[PDB]
Amino acid sequence: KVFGRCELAAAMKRHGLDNYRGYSLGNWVCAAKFESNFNTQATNRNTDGSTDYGILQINSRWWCNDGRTPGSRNLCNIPCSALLSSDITASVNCAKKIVSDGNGMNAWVAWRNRCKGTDVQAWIRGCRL
Ligand SMILES: [Cl-]
Ligand code: NA
Numbered sequence: 001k002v003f004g005r006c007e008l009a010a011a012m013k014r015h016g017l018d019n020y021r022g023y024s025l026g027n028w029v030c031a032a033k034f035e036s037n038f039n040t041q042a043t044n045r046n047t048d049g050s051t052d053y054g055i056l057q058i059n060s061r062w063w064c065n066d067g068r069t070p071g072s073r074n075l076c077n078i079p080c081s082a083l084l085s086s087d088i089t090a091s092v093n094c095a096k097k098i099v100s101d102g103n104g105m106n107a108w109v110a111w112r113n114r115c116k117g118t119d120v121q122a123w124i125r126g127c128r129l
Contacts, residue, residue: 006126008032009029015089021099029124036055053081056094
């Protein structure tokens with residue numbers, strides 16, 4: 001599913017991401033836009049053989065099992081395919097684990113290079129929340 005900007009903001013807010021660990025909703029919507037262009041089915045292979053899955057491009061090296069990433073961890077205890085669902089619950093719950101890892105949202109390269117330090121509030125502007 002390809003989410004609308006405000007539709008995704010509403011979904012994330014309902015799942016408790018707004019201000020989660022101090023990150024305002026705008027940060028999550030901005031990260032999703034640049035990581036997957038709001039597409040839940042987005043996948044991207046990395047040089048190390050791992051793959052990123054879903055709306056928030058969660059990596060198979062540490063967070064989910066895709067059966068083809070040797071010596072990897074499944075910290076979120078979920079098949080990576082579950083992160084491609086139209087229902088973002090799995091992605092949100094796993095993201096909460098990741099952001100509490102100690103490095104915050106810096107774990108998402110796109111957020112660090114394209115959202116961090118910007119007016120992220122603009123991403124939820126005009127939305128009925
Ligand atoms: Cl933090
Ligand atoms: Na894994």
